[PDB]
Design a binder for this molecule. Structure first.
Ligand SMILES: NC(=O)c1ccc[n+]([C@@H]2O[C@H](COP(=O)([O-])OP(=O)(O)OC[C@H]3O[C@@H](n4cnc5c(N)ncnc54)[C@H](OP(=O)(O)O)[C@@H]3O)[C@@H](O)[C@H]2O)c1
Ligand SMILES: [Co+2]
Ligand SMILES: [Co+2]
Length: 374
């Protein structure tokens, strides 16, 4: 069978010949007890670059040893792309959210042999689930594999926005000291009100990391956390997002992209935030209306915005989030740290072994299975 695997390009300086450190820590399990991926073998050393074209997610020796073929490409856009030309023959398609091969209804129709679509990462909004359901395609993602990685990125970005890190760094490089210039927009985070949209694997990890900063914590969720958790973390529950954002100095978005969160932070909702609020979004770019965020930063309604997720991906050269004032953006990188790559690459192989050995894929990895939502 044919496996079609879309990855981002190598660094412009070539695939790395060395790394800054000798190894990465061993992660055995996630908070709550889900075990780390359990592939039978791996053909990489954790810490290597796996999600670029030369990395191949460590999959070629395994797949070709079984007689299957593996096509790796970064060329994913349009009908003339390698991805779309190779799609009609593929039993399995793999891509990462960071450089996503969108499986639209049209492409799924053309993918006559497609039976398994794997998200190397978390969040399968690039896959049209209705068409996958219609066509009996299994959709899997590597649940929890980089949730902690994102929670780290969130707190990092919150601190940098509030404490005005990046403009202060720039004064060093420019040859200046300029203390007053740095701190005329520098605050402590301590005792601010911080709220999260969703308290899932990322959102809860964010709340736990924020707690010892002595912030006043808020959250909005469809379902409440156990009261024992709310008490230990000092959480205030809000039954609507509007209610929460009214009182928050900082808001972090940690919910998946779906109809209920598409365009949720539009002009109206952002106008309900505190003036000078900070907004962080490492969830899915489209949960925030692109031009509304730009306008709120230009007016001062938002004091700062940061995240790693954009619409579309890759972001075009003229994307307005590149140049809006007071931002601390990165490209979509938090979920593909070298540490996270090791976990989602192991998980991708685990899923593939289960697929080819006719053993069940972990229930926690499954998004649709056997023609229905999991
Ligand atoms: N590199 C990155 O930046 C990166 C990496 C990984 C993931 N992500 C994004 O982050 C999402 C969350 O990741 P995760 O590991 O935390 O998944 P998760 O464990 O499934 O948590 C998602 C939580 O969002 C809740 N929620 C859903 N809709 C909501 C809404 N309209 N308002 C408030 N809360 C809502 C869900 O609760 P219910 O059970 O009630 O629906 C769930 O608890 C992913 O879907 C993905 O898009 C980004
Ligand atoms: Co529910
Ligand atoms: Co959901």
């Amino acid at each position: 069978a044919k496996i079609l695997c879309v990855l981002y390009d190598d660094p412009i300086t070539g695939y790395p010949k060395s790394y800054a450190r000798a190894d990465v820590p061993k992660i055995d399990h996630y908070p709550g007890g889900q075990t780390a991926p359990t592939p039978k073998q791996i053909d990489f050393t954790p810490g290597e670059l796996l999600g670029s074209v030369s990395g191949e997610l460590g999959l070629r020796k395994y797949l070709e040893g079984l007689g299957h073929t593996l096509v790796v490409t970064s060329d994913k856009e349009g009908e003339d792309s390698v991805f779309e030309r190779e799609l009609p023959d593929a039993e399995i398609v793999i891509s990462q959210p960071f450089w996503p091969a969108y499986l639209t209804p049209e492409r799924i129709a053309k993918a006559k042999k497609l039976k398994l679509a794997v998200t190397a990462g978390i969040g399968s909004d690039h896959v049209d689930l209705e068409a996958a359901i219609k066509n009996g395609i299994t959709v899997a993602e590597v649940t929890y594999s980089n949730s902690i990685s994102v929670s780290e990125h969130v707190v990092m970005m919150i601190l940098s926005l509030v404490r005005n890190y990046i403009p202060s760094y720039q004064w060093v490089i420019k040859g200046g000291w300029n203390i007053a210039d740095c701190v005329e927009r520098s605050y402590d985070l301590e005792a601010m009100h911080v709220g999260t949209v969703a308290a899932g694997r990322i959102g809860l990890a964010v709340l736990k990391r924020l707690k010892p900063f002595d912030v006043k914590l808020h959250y909005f969720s469809r379902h409440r956390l156990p009261e024992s958790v709310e008490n230990e973390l000092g959480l205030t529950y809000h039954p609507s997002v509007e209610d929460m954002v009214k009182v928050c100095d900082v808001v972090t978005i940690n919910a998946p992209l779906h109809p209920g969160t598409l365009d949720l932070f539009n002009d109206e909702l952002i106008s309900k935030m505190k003036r000078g609020a900070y907004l962080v979004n490492t969830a899915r770019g489209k949960i925030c209306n692109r031009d509304a965020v730009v306008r709120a930063l230009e007016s001062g309604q938002l004091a700062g915005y940061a995240g790693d997720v954009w619409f579309p991906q890759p972001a075009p050269k003229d994307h307005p989030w590149r140049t809006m004032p007071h931002h601390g953006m990165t490209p979509h990188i938090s979920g593909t740290s070298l540490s996270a790559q090791a976990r989602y690459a192991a998980g991708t192989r685990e899923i593939l072994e289960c697929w080819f050995e006719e053993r069940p894929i972990r229930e926690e990895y499954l998004i649709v299975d056997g023609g229905k939502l999991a």
